[PDB]
Amino acid sequence: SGPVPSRARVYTDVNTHRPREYWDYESHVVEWGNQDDYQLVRKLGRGKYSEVFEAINITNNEKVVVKILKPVKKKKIKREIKILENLRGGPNIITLADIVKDPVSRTPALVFEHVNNTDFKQLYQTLTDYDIRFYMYEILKALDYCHSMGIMHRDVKPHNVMIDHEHRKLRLIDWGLAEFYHPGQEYNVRVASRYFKGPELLVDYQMYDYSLDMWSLGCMLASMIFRKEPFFHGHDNYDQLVRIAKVLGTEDLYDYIDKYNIELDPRFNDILGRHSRKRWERFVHSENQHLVSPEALDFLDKLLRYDHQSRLTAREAMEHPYFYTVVKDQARM
Ligand SMILES: Brc1cc2nn[nH]c2c(Br)c1Br
Ligand SMILES: [Cl-]
Ligand SMILES: [Cl-]
Ligand code: NA
Structure with missing residues (x-):
């Protein structure tokens, strides 16, 4: 058995x-923002695999963190987005502020509270x-x-x-x-x-x-x-x-x-x-x-x-x- x-x-x-x-995150529809609302300041040290940056939201001059989603299944991207949206405002949970794509590369990225x-x-x-x-x-x-x-x-x-x-x-x-x-x-x-x-x-x-x-x-x-x-x-x-x-x-x-x-x-x-x-x-x-x-x-x-x-x-x-x-x-x- x-x-x-x-x-x-x-x-x-x-x-x-x-x-x-x-x-049902596979059916989630993302409204992709413009990564050009942000200017990257510096790469955070997160080892060899990851791409996480300190950035500035140009509009309000507020500091954010930008996480570039390395090539992966779109399914895994929708899963992480849906979970972050569901948990937004929870105690000691990181706050998702924006979801963007670079206009040229079309690479998806997540923007967080600094x-x-x-x-x-x-x-x-x-x-x-x-x-x-x-x-x-x-x-x-x-x-x-x-x-x-x-x-x-x-x-x-x-x-x-x-x-x-x-x-x-x-x-x-x-x-x-x-x-x-x-x-x-x-x-x-x-x-x-x-x-x-x-x-x-x-x-x-x-x-x-x-x-x-x-x-x-x-x-x-x-x-x-x-x-x-x-x-x-x-x-x-x-x-x-x-x-x-x-x-x-x-x-x-x-x-x-x-x-x-x-x-x-x-x-x-x-x-x-x-x-x-x-x-x-x-x-x-x-x-x-x-x-x-x-x-x-x-x-x-x-x-x-x-x-x-x-x-x-x-x-x-x-x-x-x-x-x-x-x-x-x-x-x-
Ligand atoms: Br804010 C923030 C959110 C993140 N999500 N995945 N990795 C993350 C890192 Br590193 C930071 Br810093
Ligand atoms: Cl013992
Ligand atoms: Cl660890
Ligand atoms: Na003791």
């Missing part, structure tokens, strides 16, 4: 109850305990919002979190891999960066949901409180599951495989071996012990589960004791 079907524990049917138009190109990866190995809790809570606001709106991000990693540390402001960026959640849909498992990939992606379980983002968030939290970048340091996608198995143990992995009747790639046969579930105390040392608390470990443990159904939801995570002081200071402020 095939794999056992799965449903999201929360926000399962939100797209079903919407008008077709909300999620944010400084200071990503979380540049800051997140130097935070106080309180600031890890604070920024984690701000990321959860964005994830509970997009999940509540029927969308999973699928590329949650420090490079996709822009922070203004002076103003204590955070934005979740790069919605290019985001997808609408539909119950029973089988998704592409070739998403997310290696170190942040959930076990569902690594064992090719396609009927995944919002809980994929909660695994990625757990990987970020583990990296920050233990000062270990990345936390799960695989050579490749096969070794990535081995690195997870040496921490979470093989017993819970094989129970997960049996529960969903997953056909494990034969390449895993010799490399997973047999591993105990390790106590988190094993990762604590003199240079990270100020970031590690019972509250932090209890919270992390509830994010990093093989079984996607078992992981905290974004809202359950926001309700964890780890955030009590952040919640109290927010109400007071």
